[PDB]
mmCIF file of all heavy atoms in Angstrom:
data_model
loop_
_atom_site.group_PDB
_atom_site.id
_atom_site.type_symbol
_atom_site.label_atom_id
_atom_site.label_comp_id
_atom_site.label_asym_id
_atom_site.label_seq_id
_atom_site.Cartn_x
_atom_site.Cartn_y
_atom_site.Cartn_z
ATOM 1 N N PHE A 5 -102.057 -7.644 -112.276
ATOM 2 C CA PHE A 5 -100.809 -7.604 -111.504
ATOM 3 C C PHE A 5 -101.096 -7.824 -110.026
ATOM 4 O O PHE A 5 -102.028 -7.238 -109.480
ATOM 5 C CB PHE A 5 -100.081 -6.261 -111.707
ATOM 6 C CG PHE A 5 -98.661 -6.230 -111.186
ATOM 7 C CD1 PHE A 5 -97.689 -7.084 -111.702
ATOM 8 C CD2 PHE A 5 -98.298 -5.359 -110.178
ATOM 9 C CE1 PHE A 5 -96.398 -7.069 -111.208
ATOM 10 C CE2 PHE A 5 -97.029 -5.316 -109.691
ATOM 11 C CZ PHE A 5 -96.073 -6.177 -110.196
ATOM 12 N N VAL A 6 -100.321 -8.692 -109.389
ATOM 13 C CA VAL A 6 -100.372 -8.898 -107.947
ATOM 14 C C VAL A 6 -98.977 -8.604 -107.424
ATOM 15 O O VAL A 6 -97.985 -9.045 -108.027
ATOM 16 C CB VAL A 6 -100.824 -10.329 -107.593
ATOM 17 C CG1 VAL A 6 -101.190 -10.445 -106.144
ATOM 18 C CG2 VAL A 6 -102.010 -10.767 -108.486
ATOM 19 N N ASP A 7 -98.900 -7.834 -106.331
ATOM 20 C CA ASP A 7 -97.641 -7.430 -105.678
ATOM 21 C C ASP A 7 -97.841 -7.460 -104.165
ATOM 22 O O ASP A 7 -98.659 -6.707 -103.635
ATOM 23 C CB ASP A 7 -97.212 -6.035 -106.132
ATOM 24 C CG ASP A 7 -95.944 -5.559 -105.475
ATOM 25 O OD1 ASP A 7 -95.626 -6.025 -104.371
ATOM 26 O OD2 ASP A 7 -95.272 -4.688 -106.072
ATOM 27 N N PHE A 8 -97.081 -8.306 -103.479
ATOM 28 C CA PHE A 8 -97.249 -8.533 -102.044
ATOM 29 C C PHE A 8 -96.735 -7.345 -101.215
ATOM 30 O O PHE A 8 -95.601 -6.874 -101.390
ATOM 31 C CB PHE A 8 -96.493 -9.810 -101.601
ATOM 32 C CG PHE A 8 -96.691 -11.018 -102.501
ATOM 33 C CD1 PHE A 8 -95.840 -12.100 -102.402
ATOM 34 C CD2 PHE A 8 -97.719 -11.069 -103.444
ATOM 35 C CE1 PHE A 8 -96.019 -13.257 -103.216
ATOM 36 C CE2 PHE A 8 -97.896 -12.181 -104.257
ATOM 37 C CZ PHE A 8 -97.052 -13.297 -104.127
ATOM 38 N N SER A 103 -91.087 -12.139 -109.929
ATOM 39 C CA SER A 103 -90.098 -12.055 -108.846
ATOM 40 C C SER A 103 -90.685 -12.779 -107.667
ATOM 41 O O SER A 103 -91.800 -13.266 -107.720
ATOM 42 C CB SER A 103 -89.785 -10.619 -108.476
ATOM 43 O OG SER A 103 -90.956 -9.844 -108.242
ATOM 44 N N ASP A 105 -92.173 -11.658 -105.405
ATOM 45 C CA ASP A 105 -93.053 -10.685 -104.792
ATOM 46 C C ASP A 105 -94.141 -10.219 -105.736
ATOM 47 O O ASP A 105 -95.117 -9.631 -105.268
ATOM 48 C CB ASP A 105 -92.179 -9.518 -104.296
ATOM 49 C CG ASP A 105 -92.897 -8.217 -104.118
ATOM 50 O OD1 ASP A 105 -92.976 -7.403 -105.063
ATOM 51 O OD2 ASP A 105 -93.276 -7.933 -102.978
ATOM 52 N N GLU A 106 -94.050 -10.555 -107.024
ATOM 53 C CA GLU A 106 -94.833 -9.972 -108.096
ATOM 54 C C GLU A 106 -95.111 -11.046 -109.137
ATOM 55 O O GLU A 106 -94.283 -11.924 -109.391
ATOM 56 C CB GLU A 106 -94.082 -8.825 -108.785
ATOM 57 C CG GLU A 106 -93.765 -7.648 -107.909
ATOM 58 C CD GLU A 106 -93.076 -6.543 -108.633
ATOM 59 O OE1 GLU A 106 -92.800 -6.737 -109.824
ATOM 60 O OE2 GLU A 106 -92.824 -5.476 -108.027
ATOM 61 N N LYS A 152 -98.686 -2.979 -113.848
ATOM 62 C CA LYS A 152 -97.759 -2.685 -112.755
ATOM 63 C C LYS A 152 -98.007 -1.289 -112.206
ATOM 64 O O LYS A 152 -97.933 -1.080 -110.991
ATOM 65 C CB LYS A 152 -96.287 -2.803 -113.190
ATOM 66 C CG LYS A 152 -95.338 -2.617 -112.027
ATOM 67 C CD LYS A 152 -93.927 -3.091 -112.298
ATOM 68 C CE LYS A 152 -93.255 -3.488 -110.995
ATOM 69 N NZ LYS A 152 -91.846 -3.055 -110.932
ATOM 70 N N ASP A 156 -98.859 0.216 -108.449
ATOM 71 C CA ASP A 156 -97.875 1.035 -107.741
ATOM 72 C C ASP A 156 -98.487 2.350 -107.264
ATOM 73 O O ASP A 156 -97.897 3.025 -106.414
ATOM 74 C CB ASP A 156 -96.611 1.238 -108.626
ATOM 75 C CG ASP A 156 -95.469 0.116 -108.388
ATOM 76 O OD1 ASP A 156 -95.761 -1.094 -108.116
ATOM 77 O OD2 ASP A 156 -94.253 0.457 -108.476
ATOM 78 N N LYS A 159 -101.051 0.955 -103.918
ATOM 79 C CA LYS A 159 -100.560 0.274 -102.713
ATOM 80 C C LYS A 159 -100.342 1.294 -101.583
ATOM 81 O O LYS A 159 -100.039 2.465 -101.852
ATOM 82 C CB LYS A 159 -99.259 -0.511 -102.993
ATOM 83 C CG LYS A 159 -98.020 0.286 -103.465
ATOM 84 C CD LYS A 159 -96.675 -0.512 -103.346
ATOM 85 C CE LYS A 159 -96.241 -1.274 -104.658
ATOM 86 N NZ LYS A 159 -94.749 -1.459 -104.895
ATOM 87 P P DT B 12 -86.591 1.230 -112.486
ATOM 88 O OP1 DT B 12 -87.044 2.562 -112.918
ATOM 89 O OP2 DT B 12 -85.911 1.016 -111.196
ATOM 90 O "O5'" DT B 12 -87.836 0.214 -112.456
ATOM 91 C "C5'" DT B 12 -87.633 -1.166 -112.834
ATOM 92 C "C4'" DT B 12 -87.216 -2.022 -111.639
ATOM 93 O "O4'" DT B 12 -85.758 -2.291 -111.632
ATOM 94 C "C3'" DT B 12 -87.518 -1.354 -110.277
ATOM 95 O "O3'" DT B 12 -88.831 -1.716 -109.754
ATOM 96 C "C2'" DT B 12 -86.356 -1.881 -109.387
ATOM 97 C "C1'" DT B 12 -85.466 -2.787 -110.365
ATOM 98 N N1 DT B 12 -83.985 -2.791 -109.941
ATOM 99 C C2 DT B 12 -83.410 -4.018 -109.558
ATOM 100 O O2 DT B 12 -83.989 -5.096 -109.668
ATOM 101 N N3 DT B 12 -82.113 -3.945 -109.080
ATOM 102 C C4 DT B 12 -81.342 -2.790 -108.937
ATOM 103 O O4 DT B 12 -80.160 -2.802 -108.507
ATOM 104 C C5 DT B 12 -82.025 -1.559 -109.318
ATOM 105 C C7 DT B 12 -81.310 -0.284 -109.219
ATOM 106 C C6 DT B 12 -83.300 -1.611 -109.750
ATOM 107 P P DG B 13 -89.590 -0.838 -108.616
ATOM 108 O OP1 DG B 13 -91.028 -1.221 -108.704
ATOM 109 O OP2 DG B 13 -89.148 0.599 -108.623
ATOM 110 O "O5'" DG B 13 -89.105 -1.499 -107.249
ATOM 111 C "C5'" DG B 13 -89.437 -2.850 -106.960
ATOM 112 C "C4'" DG B 13 -88.196 -3.722 -107.089
ATOM 113 O "O4'" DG B 13 -86.965 -2.931 -106.846
ATOM 114 C "C3'" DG B 13 -88.090 -4.874 -106.076
ATOM 115 O "O3'" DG B 13 -88.263 -6.159 -106.658
ATOM 116 C "C2'" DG B 13 -86.617 -4.786 -105.515
ATOM 117 C "C1'" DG B 13 -85.927 -3.894 -106.599
ATOM 118 N N9 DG B 13 -84.660 -3.334 -106.245
ATOM 119 C C8 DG B 13 -84.228 -2.055 -106.485
ATOM 120 N N7 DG B 13 -82.989 -1.849 -106.123
ATOM 121 C C5 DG B 13 -82.559 -3.088 -105.671
ATOM 122 C C6 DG B 13 -81.291 -3.455 -105.173
ATOM 123 O O6 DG B 13 -80.291 -2.715 -105.036
ATOM 124 N N1 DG B 13 -81.239 -4.824 -104.806
ATOM 125 C C2 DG B 13 -82.300 -5.724 -104.938
ATOM 126 N N2 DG B 13 -82.039 -7.005 -104.553
ATOM 127 N N3 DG B 13 -83.522 -5.387 -105.432
ATOM 128 C C4 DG B 13 -83.566 -4.043 -105.769
ATOM 129 P P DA B 14 -89.662 -6.626 -107.227
ATOM 130 O OP1 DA B 14 -90.779 -6.133 -106.404
ATOM 131 O OP2 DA B 14 -89.536 -8.083 -107.437
ATOM 132 O "O5'" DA B 14 -89.765 -5.850 -108.593
ATOM 133 C "C5'" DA B 14 -89.362 -6.454 -109.786
ATOM 134 C "C4'" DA B 14 -90.220 -5.946 -110.920
ATOM 135 O "O4'" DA B 14 -89.417 -5.055 -111.796
ATOM 136 C "C3'" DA B 14 -90.762 -7.042 -111.872
ATOM 137 O "O3'" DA B 14 -91.976 -6.598 -112.565
ATOM 138 C "C2'" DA B 14 -89.466 -7.236 -112.740
ATOM 139 C "C1'" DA B 14 -89.091 -5.757 -113.005
ATOM 140 N N9 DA B 14 -87.723 -5.451 -113.302
ATOM 141 C C8 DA B 14 -86.629 -6.012 -112.723
ATOM 142 N N7 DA B 14 -85.486 -5.547 -113.174
ATOM 143 C C5 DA B 14 -85.847 -4.599 -114.106
ATOM 144 C C6 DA B 14 -85.068 -3.734 -114.938
ATOM 145 N N6 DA B 14 -83.743 -3.748 -114.933
ATOM 146 N N1 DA B 14 -85.722 -2.873 -115.788
ATOM 147 C C2 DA B 14 -87.092 -2.877 -115.788
ATOM 148 N N3 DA B 14 -87.947 -3.645 -115.038
ATOM 149 C C4 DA B 14 -87.240 -4.499 -114.204
HETATM 150 CA CA1 LIG D 402 -92.543 -4.703 -106.262
#
Side-chain angles (χ1 to χ4, degrees):
Chain A
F5 192 62
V6 194
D7 179 335
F8 314 165
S103 50
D105 158 270
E106 298 182 357
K152 185 164 207 220
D156 269 35
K159 61 164 94 150

